[PDB]
């Protein structure tokens, strides 16, 4: 019912970060967990998710870069974010809905983490 996210931060373009979502009392195993993100001045948008039985859903622009997975022993959902880009900068939220569906809009999810800042800088080393 309350999800704790961990693992945000600042990373350079092309780098990687991993988000994790864990739940307190209810076992997360029964939940589709969707990751949403809100960039400055835009709405929350669905990013990626895993339903209660390992089905996956992705936004088109994160396919081939993001992977959602689930450790059902640790009752945790992970977002592995590779090949990160400046336009991925946002507050990321996990949200949980009972069952097998991953609806695209925030209103489909009852339980929300508090949000983790992910920032991707155009920084690259001097040549």
């Amino acid at each position: 019912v309350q999800l704790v996210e961990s693992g945000g931060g600042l990373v350079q373009a092309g780098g990687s970060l991993r988000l994790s979502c864990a739940a307190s009392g209810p076992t997360l195993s029964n939940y589709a967990v969707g990751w949403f993100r809100q960039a400055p001045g835009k709405e929350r948008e669905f990013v990626a998710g895993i339903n209660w039985s390992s089905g996956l859903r992705y936004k088109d622009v994160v396919k081939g870069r993001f992977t959602v997975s689930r450790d059902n022993v640790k009752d945790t959902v992970y977002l592995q974010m590779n090949s990160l880009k400046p336009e991925d900068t946002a507050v990321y939220y996990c949200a949980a809905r009972f069952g097998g569906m991953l609806p695209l809009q925030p209103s489909g999810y009852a339980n929300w983490g508090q949000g983790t800042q992910v920032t991707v800088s155009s920084h690259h080393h001097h040549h």
Partner: peptide
């Protein structure tokens, strides 16, 4: 519904 379906507009 198959276990891999996640879109309510499909179900």
């Amino acid at each position: 519904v198959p276990d891999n379906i996640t879109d309510p507009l499909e179900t």
